[PDB]
Amino acid sequence: LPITGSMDIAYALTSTLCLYYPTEAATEINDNSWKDTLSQLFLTKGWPTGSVYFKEYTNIASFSVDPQLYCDYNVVLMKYDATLQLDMSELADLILNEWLCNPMDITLYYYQQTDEANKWISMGSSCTIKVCPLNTQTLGIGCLTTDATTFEEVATAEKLVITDVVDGVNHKLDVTTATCTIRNCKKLGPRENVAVIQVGGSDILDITADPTTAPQTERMMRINWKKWWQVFYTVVDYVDQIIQVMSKRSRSLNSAAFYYRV
Amino acid sequence: MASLIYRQLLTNSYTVDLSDEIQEIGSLLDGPYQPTTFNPPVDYWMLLAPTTPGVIVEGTNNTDRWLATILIEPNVQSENRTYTIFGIQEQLTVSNTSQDQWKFIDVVKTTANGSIGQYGPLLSSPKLYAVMKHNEKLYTYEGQTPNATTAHYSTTNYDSVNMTAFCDFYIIPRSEESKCTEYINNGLPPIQNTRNVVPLSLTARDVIHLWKEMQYNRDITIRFKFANTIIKSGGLGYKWSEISFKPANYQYTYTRDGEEVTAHTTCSVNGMNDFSFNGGYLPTDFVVSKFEVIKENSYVYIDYWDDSQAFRNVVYVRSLAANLNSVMCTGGSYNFSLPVGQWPVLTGGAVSLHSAGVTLSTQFTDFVSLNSLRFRFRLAVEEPHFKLTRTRLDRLYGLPAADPNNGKEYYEIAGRFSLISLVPSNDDYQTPIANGELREEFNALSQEIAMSQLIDLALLPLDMFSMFSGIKSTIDAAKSMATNVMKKFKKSGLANSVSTLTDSLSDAASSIGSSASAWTDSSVSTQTSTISRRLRLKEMATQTEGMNFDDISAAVLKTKIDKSTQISPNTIPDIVTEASEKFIPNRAYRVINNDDVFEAGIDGKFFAYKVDTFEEIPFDVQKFADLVTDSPVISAIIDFKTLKNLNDNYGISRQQAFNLLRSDPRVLREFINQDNPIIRNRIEQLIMQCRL
Amino acid sequence: LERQLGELREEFNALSQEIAMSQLIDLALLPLDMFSMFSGIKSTIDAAKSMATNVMKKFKKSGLANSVSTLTDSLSDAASSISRGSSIR
Amino acid sequence: NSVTVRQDLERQLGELREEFNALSQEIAMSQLIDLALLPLDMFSMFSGIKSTIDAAKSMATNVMKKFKKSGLANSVSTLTDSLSDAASSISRGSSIR
Amino acid sequence: MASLIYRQLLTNSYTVDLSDEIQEIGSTKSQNVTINPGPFAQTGYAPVN
Amino acid sequence: DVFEAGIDGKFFAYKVDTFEEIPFDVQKFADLVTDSPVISAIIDFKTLK
């Protein structure tokens, strides 16, 4: 129900932090107690021991598979790629926003979209998603309704794709679901659990499927590097600002993800 | 207002006869079958589909005349052809002077080994024959189309003959001779209208056909093919005749998560086209009679059955839907082999089948009947052309009959089908896994209805759609639900009274009142009873205000429908028609004229009085006659006696009596909620009288 | 087809005098429908087809119909044109 | 006989909504009330669009089928149902208000 | 008065089913469509050895 | 005694000669509206006043 307060009156941490990290960082660090020293640092900042976790993913291609997010505060570090701007952006969207959705099945149904905030998610080892349009008597356009090869392509054996096609028209899809999963998902709103930091060059990042709006939100940030330790130290001795740019969760509940506190 | 429904039940009678017309055109063939030897059963036509060149049927008394029928390809000179006729190979000299149609010769041997004569020459395109051997006479057809009458012969034992058909047949009742003949002189009726579409044995012992709602959403891959018919033609094979589409049956086997499915499915197309490679009238030159190629204006039908814990419930069907997918039918190329020269190639062939709905049907097994499903599909052309090599046609699209199986052992369609089915259970469990009184029912259930709610319902006019949405059953029947109800209503006795009054009024334009109307058609009792019985049409004629009796009638009827459920989905019309007439025969009508009120009832009670005091005043017939002719009429839901009682027992307003005369419902329900035994008395007396 | 029309014309031109007027009014009181305008007809023959709809096939092309459509079209025109000035006198 | 070119995809609901909302500008009032008094009819519904053609025949029937499916029919039927149940001497339980 | 268009779109609604059956039964009993050859006969190369 | 109500949640009640309000019961309203010929209100009580 609606609320009430007053402006004439003024006002006179123990949660859990998530620091994911990529590999090449680790293989360049050359230490195993690095975690422990960093932890001692945070402890000097007062955040108690064990309140911090560390996770290592092999590469962006894999790590994009069903990302887990198990702190009420999540910060993801992302490398740069000279050609993988698009998939970096797909991950950026998947982790930056909250997706409420349903599991599909292309082999038995015709699907569609209804709103500018509805897209199709394709996650797995490798997917080649092909779409073929339909009319109001169920005959395709420029693709034949029995051939996979005539269909149009949007992704081939990619790890992840967030595709968008014209709403309001039924389609046929091509993929071997023996290789990955497909979710028809609506963007419920902004997700505040995650701050993404690009370690390197130019912020390609675009977090919405419109050319008219390309917002540089306060969560998609950028820093350059030659030695990872300085990066981690920027991460830590700025952690108050990083935590102030983000906020706690906002959503009631997703489909039962793991959440970890101590 | 509440009775406007009746006017609706009377308006669209015309629409009725359309559907019957639709039913009339909806109104089939019994067959075909695998040919057998038998006895023509009493009073049945044997209709015969001839394609194989030559003899068809033998008929012998074994002592008396022996008759046979032979079909003959065109373009055949005088040649002594050999045929096993009557069971013996005989040579007979036959030509075919016809070069535009096919010949039919009736082979008559007055004895077993006597002389043989050719009779009944028939020059036919439709390729059809028919026989009857009944009523002490032999009816076999003569005269070319369309004058394909039947001639009559007579010889003993009209009741024990064997018929030996070397062509497939159909059984027909006598009563449809007009169809029979019109079948013969107009052509094959559509193969889809047939009962035993696929070639099969002659078994005919199969079936011909509270609550709970169960869903069945399952996944099928139908496997189907096409079945060919190659009938060559005359000469030395220098002309083929036809290559067309015959109904096809075929089984297969697959999985549904372990529980494995064995299924039988059948294909049949409808509406193909007949091209031609019209060669020369010359004897020896390649020509076609008809090429069979389907166009996207035609259709295809697949008929499906198996057994399943799910599928065998499909008789009482609430809803049926399909969301199947479209599949390519790639054509094979027909090899020709002409007696000489290079052979032509009928190459190509490409189409696609697409989903356009589904209903229920009744396939036939070699031994049994099947609760089968009918998936109807539309077509789409596909790029790879048909080509007709060494010959004069290119750039064709569609499906040829060359090799629709194309070596493909079958075609498949993988999709989903959704069934909402009903099942009878006496409670909320014990669910099955397969498959007069009503008068007293209404009369009993009546005794508990409410009064205020009754009139409340009568204030919302009942109309066509808002009548029967309170009841739902098999979607097959409800397609004709208001249809059949009106079908009977147009034969209601009340409608007949409407017709009498109508034609009478018409005849008026060329008694009691001051001028002969149609309405002024101890004695005063009789004249009044006449007027009162006759008046009941004015309400149906929308000449009322407030409510009328028949409004309450429609109300109680709808209630009787909703509360009980023992009735049949097929029994509504009877009930509504009966209730329209029989209910409330003791009705009263009142009419007002400037402080002069008159009330006449069917039974013979008549009253007249003033506004304020309601004093008993004698009745003048001439006043009633000048009055009730034109001005609106008022349904005396309240009579004069309960009105006088209401007067003596309670103070009444000017508003009160004034509106009560016109009987607004408002003041009525008002008295009711005030809990007065008198208006409740009157209303309940109205209602409890409603017995069938 | 025109010929039966002319015969009926001659017939109607002489049955305008042998009609009654009082009963005429008292008839005009009651409302007519498809059911009482052509289903009480003393022509009792089969093939009595959709006399209503066959009537409709000719009625849907008579001048009154196109005129009614023109009237509705006018009323529509009235509701759109303000960006063009009142063009109807 | 020709390879059949395809249909034309009917204009989507959304821009349709926007454009009809747009046409609300040039609406006159006096004419609107005058028209609203007049009763139209089935014949007077469709006989003003490309005034007369068989093209898209039975359009009336199409509108009818799509119209019985909308919520309005559910609402009227449910109202009829509630009234009927009342006539059935409703069990006036604990939750009805 | 104008709202008649809405009320009656319920009123006559039953009619739809006819067309469906029409769209069904019409698709059932289609007559065989026929070709009629033109003023031209097709007798190309003759039977040739 | 004229009783107006809407879907917006506004309701009023007044005398037809001079248009000021008297106290309003929901029960009076409903028990009247159930049957009475409802005249749909273009010029609402706001615009009427």
Cβ neighbours of D36 in E, within 8 Å: 1-2
Cβ neighbours of D85 in B, within 8 Å: 562
Give the CA dihedral B245, B251, B252, B255, nearest 10 degrees.
120
Q: Rounded to an integer, what distance in angstroms lies between the CA atom of residue B373 and that of residue B232? A: 35
Paired tokens of B333: 């190329």
Q: Rounded to an integer, what distance in angstroms lies between the CA atom of residue B456 and that of residue A15? A: 64
> What are the residue ranges of helices labelled H in B250-302?
none
> Are B208 and B256 spatial neighbours (Cβ–Cβ below 8 Å)?
no
- Report how far apart, in Å, the C-alpha atoms of F17 and of each of A77, F42, F49 are: 77, 19, 12
- b/e per residue, F14-44, with b = 16+ CB within 10 A? beeeeeeeeeeeeeebeeeeebeeeeeeeee
Nearest to B267 by CA among B128, B399, B420: B399
Flag if B453 and D90 touch (Cβ within 8 Å): yes
CB-based contact (8 Å) between B414 and chain A? yes
Helix, strand and coil in chain C, % to nearest 5: 60, 0, 40
Backbone angles phi, psi at B649, to 5 degrees: -105, -10
Q: Which of B490, B502, B514 to mutate to test the interface with C (most CBs of C within 10 A)?
A: B502
Q: Rounded to an integer, what distance in angstroms lies between the CA atom of residue B661 and that of residue B590? A: 8
Paired tokens of B88: 């013996």
Nearest to A79 by CA among A91, A68, A69: A91
- Report how far apart, in Å, the C-alpha atoms of D75 and of each of B466, C81, D79, D80 are: 11, 36, 6, 9
Paired tokens of B291: 């090429």
Q: Is A36 annotated as a binding residue?
A: no
Nearest to B497 by CA among B446, B531, B460, B534: B534
Flag if B15 and E18 touch (Cβ within 8 Å): yes
Q: What is the DSSP letter of B590?
A: E
Q: Rounded to an integer, what distance in angstroms lies between the CA atom of residue D60 and that of residue B30? A: 39
Q: Rounded to an integer, what distance in angstroms lies between the CA atom of residue B520 and that of residue B534? A: 9
Nearest to B240 by CA among B54, B53, B104, B50: B53
Q: Which residues does B291 contact at the CB level (< 8 Å), separation at least 6? A: B243, B273, B274, B275, B276, B277, B400, B401
> Are B584 and B683 spatial neighbours (Cβ–Cβ below 8 Å)?
no
Paired tokens of A202: 């130019």
**Cis previous bond, B146, omega within 30:** yes
Paired tokens of B117: 């004569």
Backbone angles phi, psi at A229, to 5 degrees: -60, -45
Please spell the DSSP secondary structure of B234-253, one letter per residue: STTTTBEEEEEEE-EEEEEE
Q: Rounded to an integer, what distance in angstroms lies between the CA atom of residue B60 and that of residue B164? A: 9
Flag if D83 and B457 touch (Cβ within 8 Å): yes
CB-based contact (8 Å) between E24 and chain B? yes
Q: What is the DSSP letter of E31?
A: P
> Checking DSSP bridges between strand B369-381 and strand B240-246, what pairing results, if any?
unpaired
Give residue B541's identity as a one-letter amino acid code: A
- b/e per residue, B496-512, with b = 16+ CB within 10 A? ebbeebbeebbebeeeb
> Are B491 and B565 spatial neighbours (Cβ–Cβ below 8 Å)?
no
Minimum-distance CB partner of B190 among E30, E34, E46: E30
Q: Rounded to an integer, what distance in angstroms lies between the CA atom of residue B170 and that of residue C60? A: 45
Long-range Cβ pairs for the range B600-605 (8 Å, 24+): B600/B528, B600/B531, B600/B532, B600/B624, B601/B528, B601/B532, B601/B636, B601/B639, B602/B529, B602/B532, B602/B533, B603/B529, B604/B525, B604/B526, B604/B528, B604/B529, B605/B639
> Are B45 and B180 spatial neighbours (Cβ–Cβ below 8 Å)?
yes
Q: Does an H or E element contain B318, and which?
A: strand B317-322
Place of tokens 């068989």: D54
First to last CA, chain F: 15
Give residue E30's identity as a one-letter amino acid code: S
Q: Helix, strand or coil for residue B531?
A: helix
Q: What's the maximum distance between 2 C-alpha atoms anywhere in chain D? A: 70
Q: Which residues does B31 contact at the CB level (< 8 Å), separation at least 6? A: B47, B168, B169, B170, B171, B194, B195, B196
Surface-to-core class of residue A26, CB atoms within 10 Å of its CB (0-12 exposed, 13-18 middle, 19+ buried): middle
Cβ neighbours of C69 in D, within 8 Å: 43-44, 47-48, 51-52
Q: What's the maximum distance between 2 C-alpha atoms anywhere in chain F? A: 26
First to last CA, chain C: 43
Q: Rounded to an integer, what distance in angstroms lies between the CA atom of residue A40 and that of residue A45? A: 9
Cβ neighbours of B296 in D, within 8 Å: 4
Flag if E18 and B359 touch (Cβ within 8 Å): no
Q: Helix, strand or coil for residue C74?
A: helix
How many CB atoms are closer than 10 A to CB A1? 2
> Are B335 and B240 spatial neighbours (Cβ–Cβ below 8 Å)?
no
* Count of CA atoms in the C-beta half-sphere (13 A) of A55: 17
Cβ neighbours of B298 in E, within 8 Å: 30, 33
Paired tokens of B373: 């499903």
> Are B292 and B400 spatial neighbours (Cβ–Cβ below 8 Å)?
yes
Q: Is A17 annotated as a binding residue?
A: no
Flag if D88 and B397 touch (Cβ within 8 Å): no
Q: Does an H or E element contain B445, and which?
A: helix B437-446
Give residue B112's identity as a one-letter amino acid code: A
In chain D, which residues are last before a break of more than 2.5 Å from C to the next N? none
Q: Number of residue pairs across B and E with CB atoms under 8 Å?
A: 88
Flag if D27 and C82 touch (Cβ within 8 Å): yes
> Are B334 and B168 spatial neighbours (Cβ–Cβ below 8 Å)?
no
Paired tokens of F14: 């007044």
Q: Rounded to an integer, what distance in angstroms lies between the CA atom of residue B543 and that of residue A141? A: 60
**How many secondary structure helices (H) and strands (E) does chain E include?**
2, 1
Q: What is the DSSP letter of B220?
A: E
Backbone angles phi, psi at B372, to 5 degrees: -100, 155
Q: Does an H or E element contain B57, and which?
A: strand B54-60
Nearest to B304 by CA among B351, B362, B343, B357: B362
Paired tokens of F25: 């019961």
Flag if B415 and A110 touch (Cβ within 8 Å): no
> Are B624 and B598 spatial neighbours (Cβ–Cβ below 8 Å)?
yes
> Are B578 and B493 spatial neighbours (Cβ–Cβ below 8 Å)?
no
> Checking DSSP bridges between strand B273-275 and strand B317-322, what pairing results, if any?
unpaired
> Are D28 and C78 spatial neighbours (Cβ–Cβ below 8 Å)?
yes
**Cis previous bond, B32, omega within 30:** yes
Cβ neighbours of B378 in A, within 8 Å: 137
Flag if D43 and C78 touch (Cβ within 8 Å): no
- Reduce the secondary structure of B481-499 to three states and give it as a string: CHHHHHHHHCCCHHHHHHH
> Are B265 and B304 spatial neighbours (Cβ–Cβ below 8 Å)?
yes
> Are D31 and C75 spatial neighbours (Cβ–Cβ below 8 Å)?
yes
> Checking DSSP bridges between strand B327-330 and strand B240-246, what pairing results, if any?
unpaired
Nearest to D69 by CA among B604, A145, A189, E13: E13
Nearest to A81 by CA among A162, A243, A192, A201: A201
Please spell the DSSP secondary structure of B331-377, one letter per residue: PB-EEP--SSSPPPEEEE-EEEEEEEEEEEEEEE-SSSEEEEEEEEE
Q: Helix, strand or coil for residue D61?
A: helix
The nearest alpha carbon in chain E to D67 belongs to: E9
Nearest to B345 by CA among B336, B355, B354, B358: B336
Q: Does an H or E element contain B215, and which?
A: strand B212-224
* Neighbouring-strand partners of residue B170: B47
Q: Which of E28, E34, E36, E40 to mutate to test the interface with B (most CBs of B within 10 A)?
A: E28
Residues shown for chain F: 49
For D:8-27, CB contacts with A below 8 A are 9-10, 12-14
* E and B touch per CB criterion (3+ pairs under 8 A): yes
> Are B485 and B574 spatial neighbours (Cβ–Cβ below 8 Å)?
no
Flag if F36 and B666 touch (Cβ within 8 Å): yes
> Are B277 and B388 spatial neighbours (Cβ–Cβ below 8 Å)?
yes
- Report how far apart, in Å, the C-alpha atoms of B68 and of each of B59, B98, B131, B155, B177 are: 6, 21, 10, 15, 22
Q: What is the DSSP letter of B460?
A: S
Distance of CA B668 to the CA centre of its chain: 47
Q: Helix, strand or coil for residue D2?
A: coil
**Sheet containing A73-78: order of strands:** A52-56, A17-21, A73-78, A194-199, A220-223
- Report how far apart, in Å, the C-alpha atoms of B324 and of each of B242, B414, C65 are: 33, 7, 44
Q: Which of D75, D84, D85 to mutate to test the interface with B (most CBs of B within 10 A)?
A: D84
Nearest to B420 by CA among B256, B212, B222, B265: B212
Backbone angles phi, psi at C28, to 5 degrees: -55, -20
Please spell the DSSP secondary structure of B3-38, one letter per residue: THHHHHHHHTHHHHHHHHHHHHHH--BB------EE
Flag if B355 and A145 touch (Cβ within 8 Å): no
Cβ neighbours of C49 in B, within 8 Å: 17, 21
- b/e per residue, A37-50, with b = 16+ CB within 10 A? ebbebbeeeebeee
First to last CA, chain E: 84
Nearest to B394 by CA among D52, E42, D41: E42
Strands (E), B86-127: 88-96, 102-109, 116-124
Cβ neighbours of C79 in D, within 8 Å: 27-28, 31-32, 35
Q: Helix, strand or coil for residue B458?
A: helix
- Report how far apart, in Å, the C-alpha atoms of B175 and of each of B45, B172, B179 are: 10, 9, 9
Q: What is the DSSP letter of B190?
A: P
Cβ neighbours of B456 in F, within 8 Å: 34-35
> Checking DSSP bridges between strand A194-199 and strand A220-223, what pairing results, if any?
parallel
Flag if F36 and B669 touch (Cβ within 8 Å): no
Nearest to B554 by CA among D80, D75, A115: D80
Flag if D86 and B457 touch (Cβ within 8 Å): yes
In chain B, which residues are last before a break of more than 2.5 Å from C to the next N? 27, 209, 435, 510, 521
Q: Rounded to an integer, what distance in angstroms lies between the CA atom of residue B150 and that of residue B130? A: 9
Paired tokens of B350: 């490409």
Cβ neighbours of D17 in A, within 8 Å: none
- Report how far apart, in Å, the C-alpha atoms of C88 and of each of A14, C74, C82, D79 are: 79, 10, 12, 45
Q: Rounded to an integer, what distance in angstroms lies between the CA atom of residue B6 and that of residue B462? A: 9
> Are A133 and A141 spatial neighbours (Cβ–Cβ below 8 Å)?
yes
> What are the residue ranges of helices labelled H in F1-49?
26-33, 45-48
The nearest alpha carbon in chain D to E3 belongs to: D39
Q: Helix, strand or coil for residue B473?
A: coil
* List of chains touching A (3+ CB pairs within 8 A): B, D
- Reduce the secondary structure of chain A to three states and give it as a string: CCCCCCCCCCCCCCCCEEEEECHHHHHHHCCCCHHHHHHHHHHHCCCCCCCEEEEECCCHHHHCCCCCCCCCEEEEEECCCCCCHHHHHHHHHHHHEEEEEEECCCCCCCECCCCCCEEEEEEEEEECCEEEECCCCCCCCCCCCCCCCCCEECCCCEEEEEECCCCCCCEEEECCCCCEEEEEEEEEEECCCEEEEEECCCCCCCCCCCCCCCCCCCCEEEECCCCHHHHHHHHHCCHHHHHHHCCCCCCCCCCCCCCCCC
Residues shown for chain E: 49
Paired tokens of B392: 């004069």
Q: Rounded to an integer, what distance in angstroms lies between the CA atom of residue B365 and that of residue B369? A: 6
Q: How was this structure determined?
A: cryo-EM
Q: Does an H or E element contain B292, and which?
A: strand B291-294
Q: Rounded to an integer, what distance in angstroms lies between the CA atom of residue D67 and that of residue D56? A: 17
The nearest alpha carbon in chain D to C56 belongs to: D43
The nearest alpha carbon in chain B to C27 belongs to: B505
User: If you compute the radius of gyration of chain F from its CA atoms, what whole number of angstroms results?
Assistant: 11
Flag if A136 and D13 touch (Cβ within 8 Å): no
D85 to chain E, closest Cα gap in Å = 22
- Report how far apart, in Å, the C-alpha atoms of B551 and of each of A181, B385, B454, B465, C32 are: 61, 67, 10, 17, 21
